[PDB]
């Protein structure tokens, strides 16, 4: 349907992509919550830029032509005049990802990004090439660019008057496709009815209880009440992915973090609709509910299992989950919210 409200527009998620998110949220009957996507990544994700996984840890750049990418020179990243203790730590991150599948590509923006870039205020003042910007960074490096019979613009630069430019380097795909932010999912609230089969497969061999008994035990039903509680436990246990959250999952050679069977499914249903509207994968790992380094952000974008979109403050998040749990949606929290008094539970704990 396209951006349908303000929430959709502030989420930083490309429309086409968000259209699938909503469609899948309803296909699987699961409420999907995401952390905000920085706005300088939205355009990239939409035209086909690849998204980054957990193996990559080189802070991105928020200024210059390079905004939206993960620059190889950390001085180009969101770390421009910091400390040599820091600029060194960033060298490492760069290093890590460069030995492991990640390439160092030559930054070349697209005609359109050039638009977005100039339209957003990140860059000016170019004869077409010699651009300008009041971002501290420009008082240390000189930027420029040149077209090609490719339409794209190649990013060059030098440290301030000791010439010779080079081709700006960013971290990219093993397939060469440069990396931009990935849509970090905050949590997935699946309707309990999504686990009926899981329970059965584990307890009745895929059979409804009534069919199981009639097949294995001839004609107060003590054994039947026992069997019921059994798929009842199995359903919840699959619903919250107890078993599966004990290990790590892997997409090929990429660690997708801690993730339940159902969340993985969603990830695939989602990355799917992304490919269909012209993008690459956008969800590279499990949800924030299983992130050992939980982050605090006042706003979170939510997509009901009904397609309704809204922005939620932590407080409205609590009441939200509560209402959703009354409708039979399952939710479990990151395991450290408790100790740091940040739990979304008004129960025993």
């Amino acid at each position: 349907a396209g951006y349908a409200n303000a929430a959709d527009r502030e989420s930083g998620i490309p429309a086409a992509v968000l259209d699938g998110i909503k469609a899948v949220a309803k296909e699987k009957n699961a409420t999907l919550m995401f952390r905000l996507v920085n706005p300088h990544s939205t355009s990239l994700i939409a035209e086909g830029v690849a998204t980054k996984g957990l193996g990559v840890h080189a802070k991105s750049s928020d200024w210059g032509l390079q905004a939206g990418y993960i620059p190889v020179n950390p001085n180009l990243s969101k770390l421009f005049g910091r400390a040599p203790e820091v600029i060194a730590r960033a060298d490492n991150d760069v290093n890590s990802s460069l030995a492991h599948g990640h390439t160092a590509v030559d930054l070349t923006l697209s005609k359109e990004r050039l638009d977005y870039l100039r339209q957003a205020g990140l860059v000016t003042g170019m004869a077409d090439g010699v651009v300008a910007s009041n971002h501290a960074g420009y008082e240390q490096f000189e930027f420029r660019v040149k077209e090609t019979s490719d339409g794209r613009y190649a990013v060059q630069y030098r440290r301030k008057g000791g010439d010779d430019f080079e081709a700006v380097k960013v971290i990219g795909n093993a397939a060469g496709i440069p990396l931009t932010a990935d849509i970090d999912m905050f949590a997935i609230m699946p309707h309990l009815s999504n686990f009926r089969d899981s329970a059965r497969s584990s307890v009745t061999s895929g059979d409804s209880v009534t069919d199981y008994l009639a097949r294995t035990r001839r004609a107060l039903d003590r054994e039947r009440i026992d069997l019921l509680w059994k798929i009842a436990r199995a359903g919840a246990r699959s619903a919250v992915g107890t078993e599966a959250r004990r290990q790590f999952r892997y997409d090929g050679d990429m660690n997708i973090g801690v993730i339940t069977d159902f969340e993985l499914e969603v990830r695939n249903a989602l990355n799917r609709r992304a490919h269909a509207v012209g993008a690459q994968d956008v969800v590279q790992h499990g949800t924030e509910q299983n992130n050992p380094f939980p982050e605090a952000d006042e706003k979170i974008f939510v997509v009901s299992a009904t397609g309704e979109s809204q922005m939620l403050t932590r407080g409205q998040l609590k009441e939200y989950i509560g209402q959703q749990r009354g409708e039979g949606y399952v939710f479990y929290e990151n395991r450290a919210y408790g100790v740091a008094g940040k739990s979304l539970f008004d129960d025993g704990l």
Binding site: I225, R233, G235, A239, V240, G328
Partner: protein
Amino acid sequence: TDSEEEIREAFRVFDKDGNGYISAAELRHVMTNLGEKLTDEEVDEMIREADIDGDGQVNYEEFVQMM
């Protein structure tokens, strides 16, 4: 044997509302959602089978101990 924090997550699945107790309506919903349509009669029977203390509901201890 799942850990204790593991058993509480699964427990919240049953405990739809605030309080840390499993009601008969909470169970009747859980069963229906998981593919079993049961009578109020059979519903009270699953509760009864787990209700060690006889208070009509399944608390935390009786859920974990059901095993």
